[PDB]
Amino acid sequence: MIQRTPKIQVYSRHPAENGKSNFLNCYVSGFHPSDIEVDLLKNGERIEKVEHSDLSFSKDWSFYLLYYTEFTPTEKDEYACRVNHVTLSQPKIVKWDRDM
Amino acid sequence: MGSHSMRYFYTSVSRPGRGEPRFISVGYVDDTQFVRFDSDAASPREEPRAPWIEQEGPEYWDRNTQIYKAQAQTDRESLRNLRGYYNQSEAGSHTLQSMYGCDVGPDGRLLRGHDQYAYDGKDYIALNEDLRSWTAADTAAQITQRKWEAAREAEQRRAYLEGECVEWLRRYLENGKDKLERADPPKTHVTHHPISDHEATLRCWALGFYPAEITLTWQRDGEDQTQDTELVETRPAGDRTFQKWAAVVVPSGEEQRYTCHVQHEGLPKPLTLRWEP
Amino acid sequence: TPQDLNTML
């Protein structure tokens, strides 16, 4: 296509330790055109305090953005990133795995 | 090899029915963003995005903000011309991207300049390495080429790239030296995760490194496993540093035949790692 | 510092 679908990684700034403050990151990359919507989710609910980086692009012209929020991981809370882009029929959800 | 770069990245995106095109710029030294501009901001101005550029005086921010505003207007004219060059309707959204800047060596001298463009994510036109001529991707870009040949446009780009670009990058390096001239080597480890009775994943991690360029490879019996290695894109941690991992699925009992190899500018010597049970 | 005086495509 003249369109490119996003790559999505969900990960923490520092190694996860339950009960210790950290940052949850959703890195979206490889996409064209630039319009994209990203939510971070805790137990399926949108996290309201989320920031993102300034739009930039790679040597192949594909865009990239980092979305992030402070969080304190626990044993049972689930986190995820939800991404919409024109190349997607429906939004894509990627769950956070602390080992990836 | 002691070298450094400055780059500006411009994105202009049209949006028929939703206003005039948006223009965004970001500026980098190496892998560190230091400025931004966004035409959709409440009162558009070049803004600092690294602590070491905050010292520049009001004249700096004022001058640069007028440069972006003028560039945004020029990009709007470019987008109109491009629609015509490709016989496109006024209904669709299109994107014009520009990337330019300079690479210098440890002595501060010019190694290479760049000034190139893409339309709808495809290469359009580029200033050649000579800084004197252009490569056009198609007959539309040949139109831009003919205009810019007539205007001696490359002479102007060359003058920036050999002059102001190098001079300002030298200044930024000196002002931001404690961060910009410091390589932070990766902190590394190997994890092990059984997949089944018969197989396990070995994952080699690199965390906390700067700049972003790194090579992570797995060897089996000293042979690179390119086809059998899962590599993730290098990714920003949010604290200026980067992360990466590489994994391989191995037969249970054979883990000791695998070695993870790490190369990074912050490492005196490449690292070899194994899984340590 | 960004470059000035670029002409349209």
TrEMBL record, chain C:
This is GAG protein.
